Amino acid sequence: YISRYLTDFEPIQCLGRGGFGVVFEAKNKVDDCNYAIKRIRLPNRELAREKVMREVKALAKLEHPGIVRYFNAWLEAPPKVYLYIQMQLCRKENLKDWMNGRCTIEERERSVCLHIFLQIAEAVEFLHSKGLMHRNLKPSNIFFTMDDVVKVGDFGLVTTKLYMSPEQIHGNSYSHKVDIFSLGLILFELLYPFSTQMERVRTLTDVRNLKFPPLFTQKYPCEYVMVQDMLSPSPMERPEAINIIENAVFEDLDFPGKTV
Ligand SMILES: CNc1nc2ccc(-c3c(C)ccc(C(=O)c4c(-c5ccccc5)n(C)n(-c5ccccc5)c4=O)c3N)cc2s1
């Protein structure tokens, strides 16, 4: 049996694993480029398989600066069926890692944080404009290109329900507004650095319930209002992504070192 993956690629390293998947870095022999390659073991559940095959077809249609870049997908059935998905390789340190390496207020300058958040919100607006939604938006699903461009995807590198909408936690029906709730918590977290995991969990739990640290509300009055709105218990009361992106806080963002 000839494996397409083993024939066409030189494996470099395992990047991680999660759910049905394992992710590798591998070099394509013909084009000489390194890619991230996710190998998904197709489940023994026909409805779960139906979803997987639908999801790959959907992702293949997507093209946006803030969405992971798609190259190829194929199936292998060695004498277990595997779905391989080949994407543009992102940096090893994701947004969660990035925030954990910037634990002081000086390392979370407002304009830098808003620049990163804007890119996330723009990726979400893109999905919503296509009648799609993310459903699992969180810092561990937000990576960077080699040039620090934000990339949103479903990475599945398991190393949480903290960013999940109340309606999803309760197993109720939902709409694209679930992504707005996630965005609210991410905006807060970008602006507010933590020194411990315990502090992070305690504070984000409070913020979910619209209880904010007083020093955040004072330093960032405009963003405080935005987060409040995005975290509305009622999905109807949360703003659309387009209205978030058009907010005055995102105008003329600049910082020393920003790409010209
Ligand atoms: C350490 N560097 C890394 N760079 C990358 C770059 C890309 C990926 C990656 C790969 C290799 C494959 C797919 C994705 C991804 O974002 C996925 C996405 C996706 C893509 C774009 C936007 C939202 C989700 N989907 C839908 N699905 C999917 C497919 C079948 C079933 C369920 C989910 C995904 O796996 C994905 N993020 C993983 C890594 S790890």
UniProtKB/Swiss-Prot annotation:
Distribution of this protein across tissues and organs: Ubiquitous. A high level expression is seen in secretory tissues.
Location within or outside the cell: Endoplasmic reticulum membrane
Binding-site residues, ATP: 15-23, 38
Record: active site: 136
Quaternary structure and partners: Forms dimers with HSPA5/BIP in resting cells. Homotetramerizes in response to endoplasmic reticulum (ER) stress, leading to its activation. Interacts with HSP90B1/GRP94. Interacts with DNAJC3; inhibiting EIF2AK3/PERK activity. Interacts with ATAD3A; ATAD3A and EIF2S1/eIF-2-alpha occupy a common binding site within the cytoplasmic loop of EIF2AK3/PERK, leading to prevent EIF2AK3/PERK association with its substrate EIF2S1/eIF-2-alpha. Interacts with MFN2. Interacts with TMEM33. Interacts with PDIA6. Interacts with LACC1.
Family label: Belongs to the protein kinase superfamily. Ser/Thr protein kinase family. GCN2 subfamily.
Function: Metabolic-stress sensing protein kinase that phosphorylates the alpha subunit of eukaryotic translation initiation factor 2 (EIF2S1/eIF-2-alpha) in response to various stress, such as unfolded protein response (UPR). Key effector of the integrated stress response (ISR) to unfolded proteins: EIF2AK3/PERK specifically recognizes and binds misfolded proteins, leading to its activation and EIF2S1/eIF-2-alpha phosphorylation.
Protein name: Eukaryotic translation initiation factor 2-alpha kinase 3
Biological source species: Homo sapiens
